[PDB]
Amino acid sequence: TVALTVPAAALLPDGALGESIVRGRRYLSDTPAQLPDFVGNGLACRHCHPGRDGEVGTEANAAPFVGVVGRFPQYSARHGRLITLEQRIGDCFERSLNGRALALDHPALIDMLAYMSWLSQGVPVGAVVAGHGIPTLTLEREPDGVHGEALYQARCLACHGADGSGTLDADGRYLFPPLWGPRSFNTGAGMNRQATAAGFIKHKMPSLSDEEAWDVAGFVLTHPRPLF
Ligand code: HEC
Ligand code: HEC
């Protein structure tokens, strides 16, 4: 694998590409507000693909976009065939944002691609970046949702709410996003899988033990959310 690196915003090119990258960043950080026809819930891309310093998709083990463009096209078991990055983004619009895929030549889609290509600057095509994806966490026992409930109240609730509905910021965007219910991700999302949720929670919290991450993920995933 190659190391995860984040290019400097100060070195962005003047011109059409620079401008596109900037719009891309915004669509990824502010998605429900910038793309209302395509988003069906309260989530922005940055709520599962967080980043430091205004960027999006730059954190190891939280599915960073750094280096993503060199990994597509790739086989998708979901589709039964090779898919492009444009299509992969479409899947997260339909599942994670409970919405609709943008047309494959939609200029907002091309802006998001330009942003991801900028983040992938210097990464060799084909190379795998350290920290890519969300590494799964799997324990050899059932997730204990009773224990999980107690852990939720002690470690999560303060941010994500008793009802899992999250906390709105002053501008109507989620400061702390919703974890279940009608504004959360739908059942088709990868985050609706126990080992992916457990792994995401384990790595994004710093901190929880493996058993704790496993059990609280189980509790979160007992709740209703939109059907895909
Ligand atoms: C207690 C262990 C928990 C659990 C189970 C979760 N969280 Fe959070 N969370 C917070 C913020 C600002 C985000 C957006 C991403 C970021 O910038 O880091 C998240 C994201 C999540 C997700 C994915 C998004 C979703 O809506 O499903 C999940 C599954 C999740 N969290 C679970 C903020 C906080 C906190 C404020 C300091 C605290 C405490 C937690 N989260 C704790 C938990
Ligand atoms: C949590 C509810 C998510 C939101 C909101 C979005 N995405 Fe997502 N994405 C999510 C998971 C759990 C994964 C799988 C990670 C893995 O281990 O592979 C993804 C994956 C992507 C990818 C593929 C990344 C790769 O390395 O292959 C892309 C390009 C992607 N997601 C884009 C994306 C965009 C553009 C979003 C806002 C529209 C978005 N995602 C939201 C979980 C979530």
Beta strand ranges found along 59-146 (DSSP E): 74-76, 81-83
If we measure between CA atoms, which residue out of 1, 120, 25 comes closest to residue 68?
Answer: 120
Q: How far is the CA of 188 from the centre of ligand 2 (A)?
A: 12
CATH 1.10.760.10 domain locations along the chain: 1-132, 133-228
Q: What is the resolution of this structure in A?
A: 2.0
Q: Which residue has the tokens 């002690």?
A: 154
| Ligand 1 lined by 176 (C-beta under 6 Å) | yes
Q: How far is the CA of 82 from the centre of ligand 1 (A)?
A: 32
Neighbours of 197 (CB within 10 A): 26
92 is in an annotated binding site: no
21, 55 Cβ separation under 8 angstroms: no
Residue 169 to residue 183: CA distance in whole angstroms: 15
3-class DSSP state of 31: helix
The CATH class that applies to domain 133-228 reads mainly alpha
Residue 49 counted as an annotated binding residue: yes
d(C-alpha 111, C-alpha 105), whole Å? 10
Q: Tell me, which fold does domain 1-132 have in CATH?
A: Cytochrome Bc1 Complex; Chain D, domain 2 (1.10.760)
Surface-to-core class of residue 89, CB atoms within 10 Å of its CB (0-12 exposed, 13-18 middle, 19+ buried): buried
Count of residues for the chain?
228
**Which residues touch 73 (CB under 8 Å, ≥6 apart)?**
82, 83, 84, 85
Q: Is 48 annotated as a binding residue?
A: yes
